[PDB]
Amino acid sequence: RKTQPYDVYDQVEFDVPIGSRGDCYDRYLCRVEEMRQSLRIISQCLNKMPPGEI
Amino acid sequence: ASKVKQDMPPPGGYGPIDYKRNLPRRGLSGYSMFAVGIGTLLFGYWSMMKWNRERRRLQIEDFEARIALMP
Numbered sequence: 001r002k003t004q005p006y007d008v009y010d011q012v013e014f015d016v017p018i019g020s021r022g023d024c025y026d027r028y029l030c031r032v033e034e035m036r037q038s039l040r041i042i043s044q045c046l047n048k049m050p051p052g053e054i
Numbered sequence: 055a056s057k058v059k060q061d062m063p064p065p066g067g068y069g070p071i072d073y074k075r076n077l078p079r080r081g082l083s084g085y086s087m088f089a090v091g092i093g094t095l096l097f098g099y100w101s102m103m104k105w106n107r108e109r110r111r112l113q114i115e116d117f118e119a120r121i122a123l124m125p
Contacts, residue, residue: 036073036074036075037073039071039073040071040073042071043068043070043071043073046063046068047063047067047068048063049061049062049063051058051060051062
């Protein structure tokens with residue numbers, strides 16, 4: 001979504017979680033933080049929905 | 055001549071949405087917990103000391119009753 005964006009992913013702001021140890025705990029933390037960033041993106045999308053055809 | 059009606063956000067915008075981690079401290083200090091633990095231990099030691107001394111005296115009395123009855 002950051003390196004090769006598609007649709008309108010270049011118009012939203014969010015952070016990418018990055019691990020340090022390459023283990024299961026780091027991936028669990030990454031997924032939790034990804035849920036938080038998804039909430040962030042959802043708020044931006046809700047406030048920026050344009051009109052027009054579908 | 056009907057105007058366009060469509061599902062849109064309210065004028066202005068939506069209220070802010072929280073997303074950051076919220077994990078409060080909600081605790082005491084280690085010194086306080088250790089102090090309470092040691093205080094409880096000392097109170098228990100004192101109570102049990104008195105109770106066990108009384109129990110020793112009661113056992114001595116029972117043994118004296120047995121000694122008086124033995125012949």
